[PDB]
């Protein structure tokens, strides 16, 4: 610690906060693979329909 008024020379202040960036998990999926759903807690059942030739 300096014994003189070093606070006088603090003539510039820069504060680093960052920014909320896009999650990196988006790089692991294609744009078509992600589809939002309306839910907060519990379970949701999804039905896949299928066809075949007899």
């Amino acid at each position: 610690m300096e014994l003189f008024d070093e606070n006088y020379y603090a003539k510039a202040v820069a504060n680093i906060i960052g920014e909320v960036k896009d999650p990196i998990m988006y790089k692991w999926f294609s744009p078509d693979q992600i589809e939002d759903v309306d839910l907060q807690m519990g379970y949701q059942k999804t039905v896949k329909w299928d066809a075949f030739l007899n």
Binding site: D22, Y26, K27, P31, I34, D36
Partner: peptide, 28 residues
């Protein structure tokens, strides 16, 4: 936003728009 529910919906829409913009601007 009139109320907190609308504020939350706006936040969700903003997040979705950010995801869409990121995928549009992404080049692999």
């Amino acid at each position: 936003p009139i109320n907190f529910t609308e504020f939350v919906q706006a936040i969700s829409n903003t997040y979705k728009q950010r995801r869409i913009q990121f995928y549009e601007n992404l080049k692999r």
